[PDB]
Amino acid sequence: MIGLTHYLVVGAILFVTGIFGIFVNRKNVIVILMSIELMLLAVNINFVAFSTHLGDLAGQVFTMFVLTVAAAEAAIGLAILVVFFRNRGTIAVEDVNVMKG
Amino acid sequence: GDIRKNSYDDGSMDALTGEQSIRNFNINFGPQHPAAHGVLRMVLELDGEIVERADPHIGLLHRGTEKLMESRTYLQNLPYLDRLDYVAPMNQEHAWCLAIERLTGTVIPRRASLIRVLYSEIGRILNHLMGVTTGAMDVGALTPPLWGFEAREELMIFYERACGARLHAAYFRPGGVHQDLPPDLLDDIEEWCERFPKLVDDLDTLLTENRIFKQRLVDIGIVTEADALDWGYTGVMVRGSGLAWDLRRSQPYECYDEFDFQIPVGRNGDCYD
Amino acid sequence: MEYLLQEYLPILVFLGMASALAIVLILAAAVIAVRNPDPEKVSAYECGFNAFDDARMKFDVRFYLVSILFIIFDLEVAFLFPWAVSFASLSDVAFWGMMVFLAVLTVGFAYEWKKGALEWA
Amino acid sequence: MMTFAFYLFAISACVAGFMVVIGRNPVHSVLWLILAFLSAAGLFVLQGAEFVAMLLVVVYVGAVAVLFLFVVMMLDVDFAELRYLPLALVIGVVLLAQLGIAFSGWTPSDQAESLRAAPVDAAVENTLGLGLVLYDRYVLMFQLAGLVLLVAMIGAIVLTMRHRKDVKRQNVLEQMWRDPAKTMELKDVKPGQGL
Amino acid sequence: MAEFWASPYGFALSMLLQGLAVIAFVMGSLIFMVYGDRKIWAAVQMRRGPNVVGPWGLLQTFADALKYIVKEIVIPAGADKFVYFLAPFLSMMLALFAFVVIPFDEGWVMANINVGILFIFAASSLEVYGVIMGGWASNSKYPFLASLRSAAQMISYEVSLGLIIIGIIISTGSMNLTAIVEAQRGDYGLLNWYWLPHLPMVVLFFVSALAECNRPPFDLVEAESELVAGFMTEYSSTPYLLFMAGEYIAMYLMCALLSLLFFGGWLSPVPFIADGWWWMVIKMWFWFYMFAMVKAIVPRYRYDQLMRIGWKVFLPLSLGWVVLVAILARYEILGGFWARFA
Amino acid sequence: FLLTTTEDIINWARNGSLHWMTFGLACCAVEMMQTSMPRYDLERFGTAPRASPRQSDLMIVAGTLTNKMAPALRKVYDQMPEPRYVISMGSCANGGGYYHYSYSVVRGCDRIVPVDIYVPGCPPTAEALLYGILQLQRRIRRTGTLVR
Amino acid sequence: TDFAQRRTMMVDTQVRPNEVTSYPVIEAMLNVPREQFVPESRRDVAYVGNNIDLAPGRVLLEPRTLGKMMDILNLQNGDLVLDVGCGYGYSAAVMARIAEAVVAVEEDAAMAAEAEGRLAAQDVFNVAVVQGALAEGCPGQAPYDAILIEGAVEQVPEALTEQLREGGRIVALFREGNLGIVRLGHKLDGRVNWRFAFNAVAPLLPGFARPRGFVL
């Protein structure tokens, strides 16, 4: 029998996977952008799961706005990555390192 | 005249553009390529599909014609001319005959002169039908070649009825033309001429004012008078730029003086003109 | 839920069926046709001459900016589908709120167009 | 069965998500990512949130394709041969375990039912239900979302826009205005006459 | 048999039989679509087209299909082998899969879902991945160039595709495909169909459909004269057959959508003839005939010029139409000519 | 019987769907093109052009094969999946023709690829080529198997 | 003269299209000035697609021949290479940018001395020019990972192929009348096994002819 806990567990796994992708990636900033999308997908699973099991539409409304910000974030994330690639010639995570101390 | 290092309107210089270009996008365009005419190996350097360098490799159809000609008599060499610009073979035969006739100081009969003009203009239509309608096929129009090559088929039959060959006539000879035309052939050429403008209208209706056709040709390949003189341009390559140069008028040969025709010229010197 | 069973289970069933049909068609030649590979046959095609390189090099995408704007415009249109479905029940605020939303969209679109962002780099 | 449908989508999403972040091939990551979004859409349908299930696929099919464009635009020069992973896996496992313990005892507040702003109606289809609240009760958020999207439009253009000034360009409307009657004309060239 | 058809098994067999009916119709029509496509070009081209393989060439597609089944599969040495075989599979599978929600008559639909329009959009757009992944996975330059053009094509026709049909949803009040057809029922035959109140969007949808199907004037991912065969250059035998099958199935889906959204689906153009699946099929094949005629008469755009059409022509026009239709529907101008909802 | 009638079906499908690579070298290609034009309409036999060798069953060597071109012709032939058939069209491809004694010409395309049919002429007429293609179909019917 | 443009054009049109894919070779040929390694009288024709004559019977090989010759040797960063008949040292300079070190053997004291001067003037330091007979090689610094012979041969003497490491590669242009075949050899179990690589022509090196006497 599938209850709320089943969906929350899936959400937690995707969320930790997406967080994990950010702080283990070294070679590509686009894959970090993919991990951020995994992290936000996990959030929507929570909101949809809570919404349907409570019988409330707010969580589904919240999901639509999370998608809006996810789209805006991807657009800006790719734009910032474009200007970095032009200035550095690479998009490796290990190359975003000039400033330190 | 070198765009390999990209130049941007904001003056930006990318880090990679600074490095020396060792790993470029080079592609073999031909020989086995529908737009390459079978024997063109053009090496293209592309930058986001912008052509930055084009390096035609030719000779894939070099057959040593000029060497082979040195061990043959003048008559034995006449068929070699057919096979150079083989879309319109008798037009190429004409230069060989004219050169021999000039050196030998020979005058060809009047009827042979008229026949040479007749079949030279058949060749011009044979070529322009091929050029225009396969050019349309190069920009994606499937139908124009089918209509045009039906008219070519009829003209190739006029070739065969004059000499017995549809393409490589070997019909113009030093001293005139090999054989006289049957009277019924002249009737059929006249009948074909009455229909032909209708096909030209149909091709014009399909293509000339089509917006897609215009967007594929207008302002493409612009040639100025100065460009024409850089590269030895002749024919439509100069007339499209507005230079009313045509050897049939500027340096008349055969009996073209007594014919009535006009020279079309373009104003913009692009693919559309 | 009945709606799930009556309407969505057939989608899942047909997804498997269409997949089986496509897979069987690939396996038909894999099992019947003669296989005779050799180094020249399996080399990359570049019109009769060897390729200069493979297709794993950087390539400038001159429509990159339009593709970023494609992502944004995708979300804008998404907000219209629930509005269009609910059109009969919309209140005055719900109706004119969308008009304001679409007006803000058009200001962004007019900014892109005037800037030149719709012309390829 | 619902149990089979859940685990098909649940295992597909979780496995796909893992493959996105640990795989070495960025194009393979792109294809794993779209599988994760499709699997999550399957879960959304099972719960009766069909509109956001379908909206999610529509949005991320296009968005993931754009990601593929940037992967090949900025493809690394070492594709053929493309850390503290042990410690990282330990912190990830610890975080996942903590979340699992918190979800073991999950129970909503006893007031949660009475506080619902948009209670779901069995007789109303999901898309109609969302449309009844999205544009009236949440109208302020709806308008702010439009500005969030506008900021992305301005930012992307501000940050990146540039045009090559060394390539040949055509104005399409000027191409379509070219009059054949004006651009070509016949000339009466007399014999012997050059330019 | 009553004791049977009510069980899980009789329920399971019913779905499988319904699924075979869709595959039979779509694949059976594929025999005559490829034939009919070629016959139409030939007729416009003063020639016959296939006329020897079977009577009047009617068995030509069987010969073509069989030829590929006994043709060798060549796998490029440098290709990404899993993605190489996934690309043709997705191309054919997803195009066929979209037909699960297509209704052909009253109650003749495998899945009657509330979001049928969005599901169509989801499945058709995911089908493009077959072209993008097929070109890239081959690992050769011509398929690689076509792969980028395919991504460009998606960005060109999808930005306004949703807006083009939003008007029909406003008038109907539903995304259910059957509901859209019922909204076009009335006492004036074809004058109740949506082609009339949404005449501009019929043109915009048809053109967008051509681009979505990689059909001329938007056959840019193959583009023989520029790219040899585009994304299919390195594909042979049945994997290549699947790409062609998917191209025609996707075309057939657009013919269904054109007829459902704008020409009343299975409704009769005249009151005195009955409604039924025959009207749906007649309209589908008229629109296929339009697909074939266009291929015979138009040249090819540059793919940057296709993007101009989508963003600077279709996007402003479709957006303007949605606003106009909303005002006309909101105020019931012309007595609800644009407001068909109850 | 089963196997002979199976081969007959295979030979029927292969003859009725004989796709040829878009490959023309010289003035034999002009007549090859006329064979596909309305007067003859080669495609009405199911014999349609294909731009890519991966989708081609038939190569028509239509024109002179030079030494510089010979490796390119061999390569695209090697990239045809099997079965693959070759028609030699015209004197140059058949034996070198008018350029037989040249320093830069292959004296017959059968020095590079195996040939199934030779079509004589310089050029063969569009009808002569159509006859040659139908002789290839007779050859396949006579000797065709699953291998070729 | 803008020799840089001529050098780039030579690589683009004479090396890249001739199945030379090794980017180390393309990088090296884009950087080593060919005109600095030809006699002064040949400086303006340094980038022509033909063999340059250095001395009677000796040439600087055509760019296509050298590009393909180096591309198939497949030189590694840790390789020690024997370049037989280095002439003025152009080939040694190109290989020096890829291999660890090069031993360049030249037989004409005039060219050997010029090779040292020109190699130094280009700041090439992993190339040693050793003066002596070409057919002998340089057995003092053997074994070598790769051997490049820069002129046509009829036979490669055993003494020369013994200086090749097991698993080493030797590339030589063989002459059979008017026909020239570049072959690539691999040392296996002590025997060098030769295979066809491509067709190219050059004059015969002195000392590599075959024994040809009376035949009835």
Ligand code: SF4
């Ligand atoms: S055989 Fe004759 S017609 Fe054919 S290519 Fe050779 S010269 Fe031209």
Ligand SMILES: [Ca+2]
């Ligand atoms: Ca550049």
